[PDB]
Write a protein that binds this ligand. Structure first.
Ligand SMILES: Nc1ncnc2c1ncn2[C@@H]1O[C@H](CSCC[C@H](N)C(=O)O)[C@@H](O)[C@H]1O
Length: 321
């Protein structure tokens, strides 16, 4: 589902600089990878590294500077040509070789690799389905005893109370300049929203719903279902549930690195994913709220996701893009 096709629109959006300007300007994201690599040179010095989805080539340059014997940087979009130029501009041609194409179909100049690095995550962590490609490369190229980074990730949910943001999106259509447009809500609620959540509006402790180990995880594990319980922290009206993720650099590290894309942390370009509830419900502090969430990829467009959520004995299916 992700090994075949093409996805024109997909690799075409990664052809322009804007999207890369945004990632590079994401300090939490970029400095986290820089610190990991530079602070654990033992992992790269004299090793062969593979950068899955190199973009402008930034991660590969970090590895080279750390001591990599050879780095292989691959990308399917046209941004690969601007990377060919950037590597030359920095005089790293004798260390980093570039290849244009899909990681699951191109021919590598080597058999196996010692380390694999990649920034493949999307909104709610799995949007875009790039982890599938990373797992593919892991199976075919990782040497026995090798490591993939970042190696561990997790996804969590948090209860929210914000009646004004709810009204702004839903109740709004009830009266537009004196006219009723209520029929519009039917197409608004089912859509998940990527946006920054005010930390002061969280009404429950966060709860983990997924754990991933890029060494033991498989492709089939990326479509799951999970029961969870949120422990209420405040007496307020629950209007929505927010999701986010955390990334970890751990195996063989003398200096471990971690970063969160949650509401209590510094903003990142990933923000947070919001599932508005059709019917907000009163919650009391100390209360325990049992729920269920199922995440599956759109069968018609494998890069998009489908989320089924149950809370307060009410179920709703949302779609992410
Ligand atoms: N199957 C695949 N094969 C090769 N490149 C892929 C891919 N799926 C996604 N990509 C590429 O991986 C990139 C994800 S963005 C990461 C870019 C860069 N490494 C950064 O850290 O700044 C995009 O350039 C996208 O085109």
């Amino acid at each position: 589902d992700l090994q075949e096709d093409e996805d024109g629109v997909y690799f075409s959006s990664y052809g322009h600089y804007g999207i890369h300007e945004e990632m590079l300007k994401d300090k939490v994201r970029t400095e986290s990878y820089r610190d990991f690599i530079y602070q654990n040179p033992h992992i790269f010095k004299d090793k062969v590294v593979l950068d899955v989805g190199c973009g402008t080539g930034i991660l590969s340059m970090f590895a080279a500077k750390a001591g990599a014997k050879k780095v292989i940087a691959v990308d399917q979009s046209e941004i690969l040509y601007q990377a060919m130029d950037i590597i030359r501009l920095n005089k790293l041609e004798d260390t980093i070789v570039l290849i244009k194409g899909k990681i699951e179909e191109v021919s590598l100049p080597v058999e196996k690799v010692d380390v694999i690095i990649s920034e493949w995550m999307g909104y709610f962590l799995l949007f875009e389905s790039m982890l599938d490609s990373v797992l593919y490369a892991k199976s075919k190229y990782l040497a026995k005893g090798g490591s993939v980074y970042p190696d561990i990730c997790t996804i969590s949910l948090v209860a929210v109370s914000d009646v004004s943001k709810h009204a702004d999106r839903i109740a709004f259509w009830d009266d537009v300049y004196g006219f009723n447009m209520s029929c519009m809500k039917k197409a608004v609620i089912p859509e998940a929203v990527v946006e920054v959540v005010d930390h002061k509006t969280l009404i429950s402790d966060p709860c983990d719903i997924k754990h991933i180990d890029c060494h033991t995880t498989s492709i089939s594990d990326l479509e799951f279902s999970s029961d969870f319980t949120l422990r209420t922290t405040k007496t307020a009206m629950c209007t929505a549930v927010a999701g986010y993720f955390d990334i970890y650099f751990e195996k063989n590290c003398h200096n471990r690195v971690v970063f969160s894309t949650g509401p209590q942390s510094t903003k990142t370009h990933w923000k947070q994913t919001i599932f508005l509830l059709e019917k907000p419900f009163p919650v009391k502090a100390g209360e325990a709220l049992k729920g269920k969430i199922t995440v599956h990829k759109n069968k018609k467009d494998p890069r998009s996701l489908i989320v089924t959520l149950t809370l307060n004995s009410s179920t709703q299916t949302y779609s992410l893009q």
